[PDB]
């Protein structure tokens, strides 16, 4: 009946002065916009149908046309930024917010879905959805004694839309909007559905991707132990954002970093640093690099958890991006560590894989490794053991690599390599 209509027939039906003809034509548009291969979104926009669909959202007396027009508009809003703008320009934001209070669950859900797509476009539309007052009615849909009574798909859509209101920077979401959403987000983080847990973790990862004041708002809510629990989940869609959030928190203050260590996060790192997914190994090594950038007692916890051999591991063999993060973890450790901690790093076999990476065609990793070598030599100077280290670097072919770097195109590499040869290899 409403399958494979032309755009011309949809326009004729919607322009009729007959509500049932308009309903049939709107359903036909929804089905056209729902097809898997190339839905004619631009053709529907060019036919001037977005203002008609938006007016149909307000037809309280005809719930089927509210649903069909909400679905058609959600399909358009899910497209390119230009296509999402066409929906916003048609006045859809207040019309969708008014539908959040619909007594029909399938209509309310469609409005949740549409607002998530609009807010997900970027910072400006996210902030515009917030200004039109979407947060209060969205949170009211989750104000139930137990989240388990809500329909699974409905709860997943609400969580995803809330995550989009937490997403994007320049600027980050309004502080009061973040404070308003955070108690519901904390509750969703303790739910048992994997998709709700993944999107709640993504929301937390967005909120912690910023200055220390942004991280503090989250950490103050006591979510760090729950994030560490999810970091240990078997589902990769949960581990990925839980690791991102933990990684973001340790970019903060020493005290925020300490909350991560106190919650037992380091006990998961033997598996994360050997994870078969390269992005997990890479972001886990980045997280380690920010912990080794901490206090001497925090570097000591890395040592106590047996993680230095795991850092030697990723430096020895891993995807290059992970090896670069491992080089940063070592340079940070050698910058802030005690002589005893630096001695321990050498005893774990850091020298040979650190020297092997001086052959890489990446100036940034060369700079980071040369800084680590200088830091280790400074520790050896305090013990009068510079000769033992010089021979160690010589034996694994490290001297040949540092000598060749004296004629490198980069100024900082040239200077640092000439300095090491003149100070310890002459």
């Amino acid at each position: 009946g409403t399958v494979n209509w032309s755009v011309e027939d949809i326009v004729k039906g919607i322009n009729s002065n007959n509500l049932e003809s308009q309903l049939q034509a709107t359903q036909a548009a929804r089905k056209l916009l729902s097809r898997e291969k190339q839905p004619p979104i631009d053709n529907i926009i060019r036919a001037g149908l977005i203002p008609k669909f938006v007016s149909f959202l307000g037809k309280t007396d005809c719930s089927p046309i509210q649903f069909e027009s909400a679905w058609a508009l959600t399909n358009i809003a899910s497209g390119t930024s230009e296509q999402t703008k066409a929906v916003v320009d048609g006045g859809a934001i207040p019309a969708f917010i008014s539908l959040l209070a619909s007594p029909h669950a399938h209509i309310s859900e469609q409005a949740v879905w549409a607002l998530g797509n609009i807010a997900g476009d970027g910072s400006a539309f996210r902030d515009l959805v917030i200004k039109h007052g979407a947060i209060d009615p969205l949170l009211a849909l989750l104000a139930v004694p137990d989240l388990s009574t809500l329909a699974c798909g409905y709860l997943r859509n609400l969580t995803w839309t809330l995550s989009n209101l937490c997403r994007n920077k320049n600027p980050a979401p309004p502080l009061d909007a973040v404070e308003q959403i955070l108690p519901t987000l904390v509750r969703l983080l303790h739910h048992n559905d994997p998709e709700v847990l993944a999107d709640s973790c993504w929301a937390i990862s967005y909120l912690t991707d910023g200055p220390n004041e942004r991280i503090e708002m989250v950490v103050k809510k006591g979510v760090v132990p729950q994030l560490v629990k999810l970091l240990g989940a078997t589902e990769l869609p949960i581990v990925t954002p839980a690791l991102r959030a933990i990684g973001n928190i340790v970019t903060g203050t020493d005290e925020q970093t300490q909350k991560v260590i106190d919650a037992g996060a380091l006990a998961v790192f033997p598996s994360l640093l050997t994870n078969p997914k390269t992005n997990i190994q890479k972001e886990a090594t980045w997280t380690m690099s920010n912990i080794t950038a901490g206090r001497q007692d925090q570097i000591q916890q890395v040592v106590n958890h047996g993680l230095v051999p795991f850092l030697v591991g990723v430096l020895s063999k891993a995807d290059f991006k992970t090896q670069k993060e491992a080089a940063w973890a070592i340079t940070n450790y050698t910058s802030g560590g005690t002589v005893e901690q630096i001695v321990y790093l050498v005893h774990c076999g850091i020298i040979e894989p650190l020297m092997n990476l001086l052959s890489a065609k990446d100036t940034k990793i060369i700079q980071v490794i040369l800084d680590a070598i200088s830091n280790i030599f400074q520790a050896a100077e305090k013990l009068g053991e510079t000769e033992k280290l010089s021979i160690m670097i010589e034996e694994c072919g490290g001297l040949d690599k540092i000598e060749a770097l004296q004629r490198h195109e980069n100024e900082s590499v040239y200077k640092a390599s000439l300095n090491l040869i003149e100070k310890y290899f002459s």
Binding site: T251, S289, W328, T331
Partner: peptide
Amino acid sequence: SRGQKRSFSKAFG
């Protein structure tokens, strides 16, 4: 002295 904290964008961007 001490190591430097690096954001997600500083590390991978």
